[PDB]
Structures are given as structure tokens and as C-alpha cells.
Amino acid sequence: TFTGVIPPVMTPLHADGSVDVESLRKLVDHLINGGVDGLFALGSSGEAAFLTRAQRKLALTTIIEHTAGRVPVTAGVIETTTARVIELVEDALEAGAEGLVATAPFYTRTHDVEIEEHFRKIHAAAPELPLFAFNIPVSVHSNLNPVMLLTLAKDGVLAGTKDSSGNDGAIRSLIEARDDAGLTEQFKILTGSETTVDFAYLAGADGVVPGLGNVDPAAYAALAKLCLDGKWAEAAALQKRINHLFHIVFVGDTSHMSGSSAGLGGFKTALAHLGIIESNAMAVPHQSLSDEETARIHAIVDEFLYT
Amino acid sequence: TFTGVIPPVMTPLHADGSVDVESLRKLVDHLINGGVDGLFALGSSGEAAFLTRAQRKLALTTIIEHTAGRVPVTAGVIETTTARVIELVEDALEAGAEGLVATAPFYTRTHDVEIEEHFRKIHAAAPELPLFAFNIPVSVHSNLNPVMLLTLAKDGVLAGTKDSSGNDGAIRSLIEARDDAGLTEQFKILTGSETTVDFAYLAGADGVVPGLGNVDPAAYAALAKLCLDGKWAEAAALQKRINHLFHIVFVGDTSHMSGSSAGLGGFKTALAHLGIIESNAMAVPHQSLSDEETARIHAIVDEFLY
Amino acid sequence: TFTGVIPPVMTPLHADGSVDVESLRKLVDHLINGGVDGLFALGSSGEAAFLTRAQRKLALTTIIEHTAGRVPVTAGVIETTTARVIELVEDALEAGAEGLVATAPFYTRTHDVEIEEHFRKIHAAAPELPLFAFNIPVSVHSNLNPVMLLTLAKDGVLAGTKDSSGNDGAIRSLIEARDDAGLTEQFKILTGSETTVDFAYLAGADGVVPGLGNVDPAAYAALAKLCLDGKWAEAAALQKRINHLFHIVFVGDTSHMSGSSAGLGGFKTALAHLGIIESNAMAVPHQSLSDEETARIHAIVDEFLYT
Amino acid sequence: TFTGVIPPVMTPLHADGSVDVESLRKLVDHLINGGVDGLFALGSSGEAAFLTRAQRKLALTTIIEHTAGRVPVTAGVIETTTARVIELVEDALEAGAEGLVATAPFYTRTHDVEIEEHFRKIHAAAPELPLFAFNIPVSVHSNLNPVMLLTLAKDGVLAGTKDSSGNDGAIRSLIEARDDAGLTEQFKILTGSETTVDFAYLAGADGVVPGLGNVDPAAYAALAKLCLDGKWAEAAALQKRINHLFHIVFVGDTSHMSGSSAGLGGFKTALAHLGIIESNAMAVPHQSLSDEETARIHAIVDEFLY
């Protein structure tokens, strides 16, 4: 179900910090019309860690209802530990999600044994939905063990992984190991990279979950097509262009803001400039970008956007 | 006033994973009767990260109502980011908490400027309650900047800090800076250490928040008293005894379980052995301790308890 | 001068821990006959951190003398701080090295300012030799700042970098930034990856410094050729084969040995099996591989060697 | 016997970067006259990582010959791996060192089994000299396993450890384990901390190796004495004073220099200000302190020196 270009949908906000439902609908259309293959609701690029449980449910329902079956929707169920995650799986089921995306436990100290039990219990709560393990060491401070991942795949517990480690050699070793084990169809491997998607496809990955795909969905859809057609030199040239668009995330001055403010902020500034969302408002405690910063971001978008 | 010995209350559970309210009340009594100065509900040792919001609210109300004004109760509001933390501040207000304990944002990438804003916004949600910043880099993966903390203390936003960095030198430097800045009364510094409480007090800390104090509250109360009396050599001797009881956290085999399972499992095993709580049950996905592991814990408890 | 396939030559040893000069000569021939473009003497795969200064000088002179001008030789000058490095630059000059390879300071706490001064002083000691900065965070615990690297390149202080960070996205951003700055010819970027060389070339890297290229030099030379001819699908297939040969490094049981023992040990076991070196002896305090381990390694080499 | 106050001797330099032997002798006198119990030559604070082997041998011989048997001198043999360390053990033997100080292997990836073998081989090169293991994770990026250390102590391979982890709780646990294992006399535990020496002594450490002791050797000698007399509150007061002198390491602006430049530069600046050494020169690539920075260091020295 979940292969190809699957952006982690952003959550547009109003200045009061509420979900901008009408902007979220327009963003959904932007993604779908840009040729994506699926949507991942309630990921990190969705500000899931910033939204309340009620706000998550509204965003997820908004995305599902507006998508209207055009592409499949998977739901993040990111929370510190199993019981809390399983509450969110209940929420996702109620909303009509077609997949789940969970990380290892976090805040708490964990262990591969406990990570394994965690995934098994989450799958048991919704055994008919494909569960993907989201490998995001920068946020959870554990790396998902590839041997564990493949055992769970064999057991029908995991349908795949979204890998945002930034380690292309590790993702490549995982694809090789999966293929060697005969688990190619059973375990989809999607990169979270925004800048090395060509590489992932060249190694036989199944797709990509790129936050920058909110801004330029058609660029990623075109890149995937070029890779699937074996047009590698062309793919690398388009990826280079994408990588220059990505400079929007480096505009914000991180001497006084987090990489989240600068990066998600850059993406939201780009979206507002293109008239897809009303505002670049971010959840507390994100820092605002300056008028100089936003002007800079606009110019980059005008230069390197693919459409 | 949150000074002195202020344990982070555990959450006893039934085998089914539900909050055991009856065992929780007995634990509260055990602590208060052991001479503690306050209680910290919904900390890490309380399994706050494992409890649902609804379970946390049941644990918090259980502790506040059973305490019945005997000592003050501060509430953890541990969540990833500001809006989610403020929901829990509202819950704490509804329950009648007398203080708040919050960490930096986590999951998300953060920055000192955002951490500062976070604490300002939390304090704004409940400005009548003392807000303590909880420095726990092992869990949140940010270290709270001591200059920021003292800036917030001066502004009336923070009442103190609970420091579980495990870095005694850094905690000492913070105390010294606080004192040199004239903020001694405004900003209470409590150590989260279980094994270096005497050192904290020698350096002029205001108290301690020790997980092991759930098992042996009277030992920590006695230790604090020794320090406040200036009986440092006696304090160090008692601390050494405490540090041998603390071996209960090192019994669980961490080749197949997390440190949380061994450490919190050890404390709960001790508690059940002492008859304070019904079961050593732990929230999913913690691993069970074996009957051998539990028997070794019982032996340590029997030898080293105060 | 230093582009293409440039293996970090190993140092064969005898059981007494002395340099096996006759095996080193045979290894040099193996590399050169396998079609490499250059040799990097006294790198990490050379056990430079284990050899005494006298032993380093012997290995370096042995490699230079035996190479007999067939391909160019660059010399590692790895030491904790500037003055110590500059002693080794004297040694390299005396041996007739054609290039230098230095890391940031280590053991000591450092800073980008001090890293910059360090490279400037090393270059000033041998201004006619191309100096490459070796980015190896796992060993020196600093990451070389790409802005610093390009400023030094502009200033004629650095000729290039050998990047063993394992971060393909970072190396790609560095290549893009170099190209954007107009520094393409002035600053050669070589990957230390053994498993993502195709990716490096697809992004426009200048070559590769692969330890596994000691074992299978012709595989890497063939892979570089395939990439330079634009034969990307073929390159990825050969890289996959190379990546299975690489399993030799995962045989050793790291429950009782370092990754150095298992990995360099695997390479030396492979070399001895192929009859290129006399023994798989490693420097103290490396742990020996077992007879079961060595048998395993032999079987992998027999299956996946390219020649 | 390497117990007590044992500073890691600095290496004074001329502006040209050569060892200033005359200033080094005066520094040796300063230390010995300040009441230290021993000297540790070619440590980190000695700029060992910046000196060539030939310079290290000149510094070591200078210190041993000038000391003239007044207190014992242990020698650092800091190098990446075993063969290179053993070359330096030979140099130390030639110079007449009375002890050796070695770290885990570095640069290379290592493992506890290899660390163990490393120390065994170093001890085998000079089995008559006490070998101390130097735990400095910030520089070597391995933590020495305490079970390994006590195994080696039992086997006669290690005489002790100099612990600069900055982790007081871990150092305390090591002392407790050592004592419980009956290895108290066989394995001396010295802290590298400059600011938590009182805590180390309270827990029964054997001494201290403080960089700041180059500047103020009498303060550390006085502090050790207070602790050994059981005057803990006095010790903590003196430690606090020391910790204010220690602000000299925080003057250099680390936006454009390493911690080594600020910290070692601060100590050398203090030393030159006191007239003990000719210049505050530092080995390449350390950055210079500004005349403002130096003047602020002088002010701190003037206020807080013992």
C-alpha cells in the first residue's frame, strides 16, 4: 500500500496556534495534484510533537476526509511509550487511517527487547493496518536494530520502515539484508531523506517521505519517475535542483532558533508564498522568521521550484 | 516551599497495568511517615512517561487527597512541547497541586531561546505555583543552561530546579553562581542524585529528590538531618549504606532489559517485599524481573535498609 | 594529482609486530596491477595509529620505492597536534611523498579556529605538496566544517578532502557548495566509503579511498570506470557485489574485540588467503580472529571477489 | 606511593614554542614549596599532546632532576596505542621516573578486552613502577570499565587510577567497590577534579591531581589537610574559594578558541602574573588570550589566591 512519494503532511496553523483546517485542505490538494502516491499524517514535519491529542485527531480527520480516497493515508502515532501510543492507534482507527507509523519508546531509557515488545503490542491493537517503524535517532535517541526489524517483518508485525537516520550506507545495508532474507515484498523501505532520494532508489528503496515534498510535490514525483525509468543522470540533476530549493531551511538564524524553527518555518514560509496556506505560523515555542529571512526564502522558492 | 527530602513518588500498578490506588495511598503513608518534606508526583520514577494522561490524573489526585495537607505536593507536567505541557498544568490545577515540575521540550530539536520561552509560557499558565525546571539530559537530550535558569529565577518564572544530570561539579557551580547573584532564596536547587546527597548538601543545595527514597524514606530524612547538623562524617557513612541498598537497581540483567526495567523494577520489588505495595508490576514495555533477581533484591533490602 | 581509486594501503606485519616489508611490496603490486590510480600510505587502514614513527617511515619508504613512480603516493601525517604532525611532514618529505593527508587535532579539545590554524601551518611546512584534510569523526571526534574547508581551498592551503564521516548527504552538500563556489578543480573530494562509492560518483565526487580496495582493487577500479561511463545501473550492481565481499568485516565477534580487530583483521585474513601477504598478524592490542572466523572470511572472499 | 596532592605539572614555553626549562624548574619549586605530595609530569595540563617526544623527554628530565628526590614523580606515557606507549615507557625509565600514567588506546576504535591487554603490556614493560590508569573520556572517548580496573588491580597490573571523568557518583561507586573487594591498599583512586576534591576525600579517595594546583598548590595542600583532619565544613569553604580562583579558565572567549586555550591559557597567565614562569605562551595551535582577558585573569588571581 505504502510505497512511492509519501510526504509527511504539515499542519498549517493560525496565529492563535489552532489548526488551520481550510489551509490543511488546500495543502492536501496541492500534494495530491502534485502527483504523490500517499500521505503520512502526524509525522515530525506535521508538528505532531507540538499538537495536542485533540488537534492531532482534527488534522488527521481533516486529511482523510479531504483526500476522499484519492491516495492512501497513514497516521503517525508518536508518543513516549506503548500505552500512550495505543490510545493514538484508537484515534487513528476511528478516523479511518489506512496505516500506522510508530517510533521506539522515548524519554524513557529503552532496549531492543522492549522496542520489540512495543511494536508487537502496537500491531496487536490494529492488526489489519500496515505498521511502519519510523527510525529517527535525532528525536528518539535510539537506532532501530535492523535484525529486529527483519524478524518483525517475517512475523507480520511490521510492514516497513521510514528511515530518517540520514545514514544512506545503513539504509542500503538494510535493503540488501531484506532482499537476502527474501523479505522484499513483505517489508517496504522508505527513506526520509530529502537530498539523497536518487541514491535510495538506486539501491532499491520503495519510496520516500520528504518534508520538502510539501513545498514541491511534483519535483519528488518527477524524481521518482526518472529513477523508476532508470534515468539516473537525469534523476541526479533533478535531485541537485531539489537540493538547492532545500536551502530554504538554512536561511533562519539558528543562533537564536532551533533547526525545527528554521526548517519547518522555511517550509511554511514557502507554502504561504505559493498561496497554499494562509500563514507561516508555527506552534509554541518555535521562533518566528524575520522579514529579511522570509524575503530570502521567497527568492529561493522562486528560483528553484520545479513547477 | 519545596526544600528538603522530596521523593518522586512511584506508581504502583496491578498486574493488568491499571493504577493501584490502594497501594499508592500506602506508599504515600510510608513516605510521609518516614519523615519526608514533600512529594513529587508524576516524575520519571512515577512512570509518568508510561502512564496515560487519564492514569496520571488518577495517580495525582490519589496522592494529593491521601496526603491531606500533611506535606506539600508538586506535580510533574512532563510532555514533549509547550501546548501539551499546559494541558497537564490545567490538570494539576484541577487536582490541587502546590507546585509544577517541567523539563525542556523533547522529541523536537530545541534551542536555549525556545527552552526559555517554554518555561515562560508554562509559568504564565499557573503563575501562583512554584515552577521547578527538571534537568534530565538522559531523557530529554538537552542540558539546561545555568545562565538561563538564573535569568528566569530573577524574573520570577522559576522557583528552582531538580537536577538529575549526575554532574555534581555542574550542580555545585550552579549553586555558587546563584549565591553570587543574590538569588539564594529565590531559586531552590534540589539534587536528583541518590548516591551523592551528602555532597549536594555540603555544597549548600536545598534538598533532594531521590527515587530510592520511595524504598527508604527514613534513611534520606536521617541523612538530610545529619547534614543540616554538620555531622558530615556520619552523613557520608549513612550515604555509603544507602548506596549499598541502591544495588537493588543493578540486579536486573540489562542484557535483555532497559535500565528503567532494572532500576524502577528493583525499587518496586523492594516495596512489595516490604509490604508497602501489592505487586512489583511495571508498565508496558518494561521487562519482568526473574524470581532469582527478586530474591537477590530481597537480600539486599534485608541487609541494607535503614 | 589525487583523484580516482586511491586505497589506504595496509601494513602487513610479522608475528613479532614488525613491518613485513616483502609482503608490503607484494601488496603494492597487487594494488597497482589491480588498476588503482594512486596509493594513500599511513592511513587508518594502514594501522598508522599502531605503528611507531620509525615503522611509519619504513612502510612509507617501502611503498614509495616499490611503486617506482607507477602511481602517485600520498602520506598520512596523523598525530594529535601541529608540532607532532610537522615532524611527520619532515619524514614524508624525506621519503619523497607526493601528497599529505592530515586530520584535525585530537586527544585535545579543539575548535574550528584552531583546526584552521593547524592546516595552515602544516601546508606552510610543505607548500609544494597537495594537502588533503581527512574528515574522520569516529577517530578524532570533531567534524571538519565545510565552510572552513572551502575557505582553505580558495586560499590554496587544502587541495582536497578524504571524507570518512559515512554521511553521504553531508558529502553531497559539500560537493554542491564547492561547485557553487567555483572551486571544482581546486578542491578534490574523495569518499572514504566502501559501500556507497556509486553514490559519491553520481554526485560528482573525484574518487574513493576504500580500505576494502586492498582486498579487491580491480572491483573498485571497475566500479569507478562504470560510473565515469554513466553506466549507473551496472555500477550499482557491482557495488552490491562489493558490499557482500565487505561482509568479511562482520565475521569477527565484537563481543570480545574492537571493530578495528574485526574489520582490518578481516581484510588481512582475506589478503593472506589470496597469497598477497604472509600473515594476518595485527598490531597490539588487536585481538586475533579464530580459525572458525578465518574460515568464514575465506568463504566470503571465494564467493564475492571480483577478479 | 602516589597519594595526596599530585599536580599535573604544566610545561612553560618560550614565545618560540620551545620548553622553557628555567621556568619549569621554578614551577617545580613553586609546587614542592607549596606542600604537594608528588608531581605528575606529561599529563594533559602539561600539554603532553602538543609536545614532541623530544620535548616531552626534556620536560620530564627537567622536572625529575630539579625535584631531586623531594617528592616522587610519575610520568605520563600518553600515545594512541600500545607500541607507541611502550616507547615512552622506555623514555620514562631512562629519565628515572617513579611511576607511569597511561590512558586507553585512542584514535583507534577499542574494546574493553583490548584496553585490558594494553594495560597488561604496558605494565610488562616496566613492572617495577606503579602504573596508574588515567580515565579521561573527553580526550580518549572510552570510559574505563571499573570491573576491569579492579581485575587489573588484583592482578598487580594497576596501582591506581587518576579519574578525570567529572563523574563524582561513578568515582564514589568505584571506591566503594574497591573497598568491598578488599583492594583498598592495592589500588589508589585519585580524582582529577579541581572543584570537587572535598567530595572525593569525603568518599575516601586517596588524593587529587588538579591542574589548578599549578597556580595554587598551597590551597590544595591545605584542603587535603582539612579533609584528613575531618574539618569538612572548613574544607567545603576552602573548596568554594578555590572554585572562584578556578574562574580563570572561563575568561577566554571560547567563541574563537578551544577549552584548552582558555583553560590552560588561564593557568599559564596566572603563573606568569605570579612571576613563576616567564611567559603565558601556549603550544600551536592554541589561541592567544587578549590583554583584556589577561587583565581579568590577574584580577581573579589577586582576589582568590590562597
Three-state secondary structure of chain C: CCCEECCECCCCECCCCCECHHHHHHHHHHHHHCCCCCEEECCCCCCCCCCCHHHHHHHHHHHHHHHCCCCCEEEECCCCCHHHHHHHHHHHHHHCCCCEEECCCCCCCCCHHHHHHHHHHHHHHCCCCCEEEEECHHHHCCCCCHHHHHHHHHCCCCCEEEECCCCHHHHHHHHHHHHHCCCCCCCEEEECCCCCHHHHHHCCCCEECCHHHHCCHHHHHHHHHHHHCCCHHHHHHHHHHHHHHHHHHHCCCCCCCCHHHHHHHHHHHHHHHCCCCCCCCCCCCCCCCCHHHHHHHHHHHHHHCCC
Cβ of residue A138 closer than 8 Å to a chain C Cβ? no
Q: For residue B152, what are the domain limits? A: 1-306
Contact B168/D232, CB-based, under 8 Å?
A: no
Q: Cell 510526504 maps to which residue?
A: A7
What order do you get walking across the sheet with C207-208 strand by strand? C4-5, C207-208, C188-191, C160-163, C131-135, C100-102, C73-76, C39-41
Output the DSSP codes for A67-132: HTTSS-EEEE---SSHHHHHHHHHHHHHHT-S-EEE----SS---HHHHHHHHHHHHHHSTTSPEE
Alpha carbon distance D15, A275 (integer Å): 63
- Tell me the sheet residues that pair with A207: A4, A190
**C with A: touching (≥3 Cβ pairs within 8 Å):** yes
Closest by CA to C60, choosing from C30, C26, C19, is C19
**D with A: touching (≥3 Cβ pairs within 8 Å):** no
Yes or no: say if A289 and A265 are a contact pair by the CB < 8 Å rule. yes
Cβ count near A170 (within 10 Å): 16
Yes or no: say if B10 and B41 are a contact pair by the CB < 8 Å rule. no
* Residue C304, phi-psi category: left (phi > 0), alpha (psi -120 to 50), beta (remainder): alpha
Alpha carbon distance D24, D32 (integer Å): 12
Q: Which chains touch B (3 or more CB pairs under 8 A)?
A: A, D
Cell of A297: 526564502
Cβ count near A25 (within 10 Å): 16
At D152, which amino acid appears? L
Non-local CB neighbours of D99 within 8 Å, separated by 6+ positions: D2, D72, D73, D74, D75, D129, D130, D131, D132, D159
Closest by CA to C190, choosing from C204, C171, C169, C206, is C206
Overall size of chain D counted in residues: 306
- Find chain C residues with C-beta within 8 A of A232's C-beta: 202, 230, 232-233
Q: Which helix (H) or strand (E) holds D51?
A: none
Cell of C22: 616483502
3 state DSSP class of A48:
coil
Cβ of residue A169 closer than 8 Å to a chain C Cβ? yes
- The residue of chain C with its CA nearest to that of D105 is C285
Q: Which helix (H) or strand (E) holds A162?
A: strand A160-163
Rg, Å, chain C Cα set: 18
- The residue of chain D with its CA nearest to that of B176 is D240
The per-residue b/e assignment along B232-271, b for 16 or more CB within 10 angstroms, e otherwise, is bebbbebbbbbbebbbbbebbebeebbbbbbbbbbbbbbb
Q: Regarding beta strands B160-163 and C207-208, do their DSSP bridges make them parallel or antiparallel, or are they unpaired?
A: unpaired
Cβ of residue D121 closer than 8 Å to a chain C Cβ? yes
Yes or no: say if D36 and D213 are a contact pair by the CB < 8 Å rule. yes
The per-residue b/e assignment along D135-174, b for 16 or more CB within 10 angstroms, e otherwise, is bbbebbbbebebebbbebbeeebbbbbbbbbbbbbbbbbb
Alpha carbon distance D59, D76 (integer Å): 11
- Counting Cα atoms < 13 Å in the Cβ hemisphere of D223 gives 32
Yes or no: say if A289 and A297 are a contact pair by the CB < 8 Å rule. yes
DSSP A12: -
Closest by CA to A11, choosing from A221, A233, A238, A286, is A286
3 state DSSP class of A163:
strand
Cell of D232: 569538612
What's the CATH code of the domain at A91?
3.20.20.70
Alpha carbon distance A268, A278 (integer Å): 10
Question: Exposure of C114 by Cβ count < 10 A (0-12 exposed, 13-18 middle, 19+ buried)?
Answer: buried
Angle at which helices A291-304 and A259-273 pack, to 10 degrees?
Answer: 60
Angle at which helices B168-180 and B146-154 pack, to 10 degrees?
Answer: 40
Cβ count near A58 (within 10 Å): 18
The residue among D284, D289, D290 with the most chain C CBs within 10 A of its CB, best to mutate, is: D284
Per the structure, the count of domains in chain B is 1
Yes or no: say if C207 and C179 are a contact pair by the CB < 8 Å rule. no
End-to-end CA distance of chain A, in Å? 27
Whether a cis peptide bond, with omega within 30° of 0, leads into A217 is: no
Q: Regarding beta strands D100-102 and D131-135, do their DSSP bridges make them parallel or antiparallel, or are they unpaired?
A: parallel
The residue among D138, D167, D168, D198 with the most chain B CBs within 10 A of its CB, best to mutate, is: D168
Considering only CB atoms, C169 lies closest to which of A172, A195, A202, namely A195
Alpha carbon distance C252, C268 (integer Å): 12
Give the number of beta-carbon pairs within 8 Å between B and D. Answer: 57
Contact C287/D80, CB-based, under 8 Å?
A: no
- The residue of chain A with its CA nearest to that of C232 is A232
How far D168 CA sits from the closest chain C CA (Å)?
A: 21
Phi, then psi, of D134 in degrees rounded to 5: -105, 110
Yes or no: say if C118 and C105 are a contact pair by the CB < 8 Å rule. yes
Cβ of residue A125 closer than 8 Å to a chain B Cβ? no
Cβ count near D130 (within 10 Å): 18
Q: What is the largest CA-CA distance in chain B?
A: 53
Non-local CB neighbours of C299 within 8 Å, separated by 6+ positions: none
Cell of D55: 620535548
Long-range contacts of A237-244 (CB under 8 A, 24+ apart): A238/A306, A239/A195, A239/A196, A239/A197, A239/A198, A240/C176, A241/A304, A241/A306, A242/A194, A242/A195, A242/A197, A242/A212, A242/A216, A242/A304, A242/A306, A243/A195, A243/C172, A243/C173, A243/C176, A244/A300, A244/A303, A244/A304, A244/C176
Long-range contacts of B237-242 (CB under 8 A, 24+ apart): B238/B198, B238/B306, B239/B195, B239/B196, B239/B197, B239/B198, B240/D176, B240/D203, B241/B304, B241/B306, B242/B194, B242/B195, B242/B197, B242/B212, B242/B216, B242/B304, B242/B306
Angle at which helices B232-245 and D168-180 pack, to 10 degrees?
Answer: 80
Yes or no: say if C148 and C120 are a contact pair by the CB < 8 Å rule. no
3 state DSSP class of B86:
helix
- Using CA atoms of C74, C79, C81, C87 in order, give the dihedral in degrees to the nearest 10: -70
Cell of D304: 582568590
Output the DSSP codes for B193-219: -SS-HHHHHHTT--EE--GGGGT-HHH
Contact A173/C243, CB-based, under 8 Å?
A: yes
Q: Regarding beta strands C39-41 and D160-163, do their DSSP bridges make them parallel or antiparallel, or are they unpaired?
A: unpaired
* Residue A296, phi-psi category: left (phi > 0), alpha (psi -120 to 50), beta (remainder): alpha
Cβ of residue B141 closer than 8 Å to a chain A Cβ? yes
Cell of B106: 523533547
Alpha carbon distance C272, C286 (integer Å): 17
Contact A81/B284, CB-based, under 8 Å?
A: yes
- Tell me the sheet residues that pair with D76: D101
Q: Regarding beta strands C207-208 and B73-76, do their DSSP bridges make them parallel or antiparallel, or are they unpaired?
A: unpaired
Contact D193/B166, CB-based, under 8 Å?
A: no
How far A4 CA sits from the closest chain C CA (Å)?
A: 20
Q: Which helix (H) or strand (E) holds A161?
A: strand A160-163
Alpha carbon distance B189, B200 (integer Å): 9
3 state DSSP class of D40:
strand
In sequence order, which ranges of chain B are alpha helices (DSSP H)?
Answer: 21-33, 53-67, 82-95, 112-125, 137-140, 146-154, 168-180, 197-202, 217-228, 232-245, 259-273, 291-304
Cβ of residue D240 closer than 8 Å to a chain B Cβ? yes
Considering only CB atoms, A169 lies closest to which of C166, C173, C233, namely C166
Phi, then psi, of D255 in degrees rounded to 5: -75, -20
Q: Using alpha carbons, list the distances in angstroms from residue C116 to A91, C103, C113, C120, C122.
A: 54, 11, 5, 6, 10
3 state DSSP class of A36:
coil
At A101, which amino acid appears? V
3 state DSSP class of D116:
helix
DSSP A27: H
Closest by CA to D55, choosing from D16, D83, D27, D99, is D16
Q: Regarding beta strands D73-76 and D100-102, do their DSSP bridges make them parallel or antiparallel, or are they unpaired?
A: parallel
Output the DSSP codes for D175-227: HHHHHHTT-TTT-EEEE--SS-HHHHHHTT--EE--GGGGT-HHHHHHHHHHH
Q: Cell 532499491 maps to which residue?
A: A204
Q: Which chains touch C (3 or more CB pairs under 8 A)?
A: A, D
How far B263 CA sits from the closest chain A CA (Å)?
A: 11
Question: Exposure of B279 by Cβ count < 10 A (0-12 exposed, 13-18 middle, 19+ buried)?
Answer: middle
- Tell me the sheet residues that pair with A203: none
Cell of D256: 574563537
Whether a cis peptide bond, with omega within 30° of 0, leads into C285 is: yes
What's the count of helices (H) and strands (E) in chain D, helices before strands?
12, 8
How far does Cα C7 stand from its chain's mean position?
Answer: 5
Non-local CB neighbours of C189 within 8 Å, separated by 6+ positions: C160, C161, C163, C171, C174, C175, C178, C205, C206
- Counting Cα atoms < 13 Å in the Cβ hemisphere of B192 gives 23
End-to-end CA distance of chain D, in Å? 27
Q: Which helix (H) or strand (E) holds B109?
A: none
Considering only CB atoms, C203 lies closest to which of A169, A203, A236, namely A236
How far D283 CA sits from the closest chain C CA (Å)?
A: 8
Contact B109/A283, CB-based, under 8 Å?
A: no
Angle in degrees, CA C167, C169, C173, rounded to 5:
120
End-to-end CA distance of chain B, in Å? 27
3 state DSSP class of D285:
coil
Non-local CB neighbours of C173 within 8 Å, separated by 6+ positions: A195, A243, C146
Whether a cis peptide bond, with omega within 30° of 0, leads into B285 is: yes
Alpha carbon distance B1, B266 (integer Å): 30
Alpha carbon distance B258, D56 (integer Å): 45
Non-local CB neighbours of C92 within 8 Å, separated by 6+ positions: C60, C75, C77, C100, C126, C129
At D74, which amino acid appears? T
Yes or no: say if A192 and A164 are a contact pair by the CB < 8 Å rule. yes
